[PDB]
């Protein structure tokens, strides 16, 4: 009854940040030692809990959120952070309890001539609430006149493509990010550690 962290991290395909994928972990024992002892991660930062004590605690609901972002945007995946990705794609709460893991994926998510499948949300009327997921593709009204569904003067498509290339700098190279959130609500603690 091992927790299926393999199919999240070792997955072949990753979702876009605006449509970040979410998996839930329940009714299993999680060996976190396999995670924090593997040095294949560029960033591994935990808030409200350390990687060690994770192996000695239990939680009711744990969520792995997987997506792909830019390198220089990995800083935005943190509590109390502002920026395009944080404000419009993925927002973490101030009281966040959990870990953020990010590793470079240039060899997997970059291609010659540009990989344009990954997209991020560029504009929104209001800031994104924590863990809120928005996949609407309506035209963003950027001023006085309405758009009626067309682009132009103060009328832009909210979603823009990344365009990852292998020869780009480390700040432009794609990074795969998994956010592990452990909540421990008033519920049975289905996940535990050895």
């Amino acid at each position: 009854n091992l927790c299926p962290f393999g199919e999240v991290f070792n997955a072949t395909r990753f979702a876009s940040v605006y449509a970040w994928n979410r998996k839930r972990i329940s009714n299993c024992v999680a060996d976190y030692s396999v995670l924090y002892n593997s040095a294949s991660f560029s960033t591994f930062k935990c808030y409200g809990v350390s990687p060690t004590k994770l192996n000695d605690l239990c939680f009711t609901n744990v969520y792995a959120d997987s997506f792909v972002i830019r390198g220089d945007e990995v800083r935005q995946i943190a509590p109390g952070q502002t920026g395009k990705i944080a404000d419009y794609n993925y927002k973490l709460p101030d009281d966040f309890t959990g870990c953020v893991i990010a590793w470079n994926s240039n060899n997997l998510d970059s291609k010659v001539g540009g990989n344009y499948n990954y997209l991020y949300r560029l504009f929104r009327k209001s800031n994104l609430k924590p863990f809120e997921r928005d996949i609407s593709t309506e035209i963003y009204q950027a001023g006085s006149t309405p758009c009626n569904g067309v682009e132009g003067f103060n009328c832009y498509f909210p979603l823009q493509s990344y365009g990852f290339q292998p020869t780009n700098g480390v700040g432009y190279q794609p990074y795969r990010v998994v956010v592990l959130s452990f909540e421990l609500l008033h519920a049975p603690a289905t996940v535990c550690g050895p």
Epitope: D72, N104, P166, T167, N168, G169, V170, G171, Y172
Partner: antibody, heavy 124, light 113 residues
Framework: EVQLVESGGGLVKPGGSLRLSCAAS????????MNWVRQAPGKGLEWVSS????????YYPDSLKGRFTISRDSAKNSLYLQMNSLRADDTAVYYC?????????????????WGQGTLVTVSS | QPVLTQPPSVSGAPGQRITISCTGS?????????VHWYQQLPGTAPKLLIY???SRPSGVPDRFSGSKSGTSASLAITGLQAEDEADYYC????????????FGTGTKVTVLG
């Protein structure tokens, strides 16, 4: 059309600190990575520092031991390099450079445009 | 780690073709990163001459060409001119956050005759 003008160079005592400024014009300032490079008199070229377009990411080589700091200002379209614990080996002509466009294949890898450069001399 | 190596100086008479080598490692050039070439006239700042290891910006004549293969790169100048006497620097990128931009040694080109 792309202008990069440096200022702030001069004499600085060993162990002291100095700030170099670089004004940029002719392009969307907040859309390009910016860099500082240096060249000792009669010597080669060494990359000194780099900053992302938004300005929240900083990159330095380990040789400088973290005594250099790069910042950017879009309210003045300027780029600043602060140098601390300076020594005679840091005496060089410093150039501020603009990286390649983000919509190219060599983004954040080179120095498309260069400034006139300013001479920083560390002496007692 | 730590720099790219170039011949200290390459010389040639006006008319022929000369080449400047740029020897990198598996960390910068063999890692899939392109090479750039900058030309510095005496008393002036460096100017971009070749980017993408084979592409020239506006104002660079076809006499300048670039190539890369394996862990090495090369810059070729065909039909040498007296105005080409200058310092030529190659440059590449390293994925390691402690290195990143790797600069070449630099080659002084002089024209004979």
């Amino acid at each position: 059309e792309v202008q990069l003008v440096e200022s702030g160079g001069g004499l600085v005592k060993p162990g002291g600190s100095l700030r170099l400024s670089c004004a940029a014009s002719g392009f969307t300032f907040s859309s390009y990575y910016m860099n500082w490079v240096r060249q000792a008199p009669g010597k080669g070229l060494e990359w000194v520092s780099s900053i992302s377009s938004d300005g929240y990411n900083t990159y330095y080589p380990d040789s400088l031991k973290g005594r250099f700091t790069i910042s950017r200002d879009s309210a003045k379209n300027s780029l600043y390099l602060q140098m601390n614990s300076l020594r005679a080996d840091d005496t060089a002509v410093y150039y501020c450079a603009r990286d390649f466009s983000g919509h190219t294949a060599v983004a954040g890898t080179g120095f498309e445009y260069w400034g006139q450069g300013t001479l920083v001399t560390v002496s007692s | 780690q730590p720099v790219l190596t170039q011949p200290p100086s390459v010389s040639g008479a006006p008319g022929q073709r000369i080449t400047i080598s740029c020897t990198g490692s598996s960390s910068n050039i063999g890692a899939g990163y392109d090479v750039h070439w900058y030309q510095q006239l005496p008393g002036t700042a460096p100017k971009l001459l070749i980017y993408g290891s084979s592409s020239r910006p506006s104002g660079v004549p076809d006499r300048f060409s670039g190539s890369k293969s394996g862990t090495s790169a090369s810059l070729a100048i065909t039909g040498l001119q007296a105005e080409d006497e200058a310092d030529y620097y190659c440059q590449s990128y390293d994925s390691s956050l402690s290195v990143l931009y790797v600069f070449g040694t630099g080659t002084k080109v002089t024209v004979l005759g």
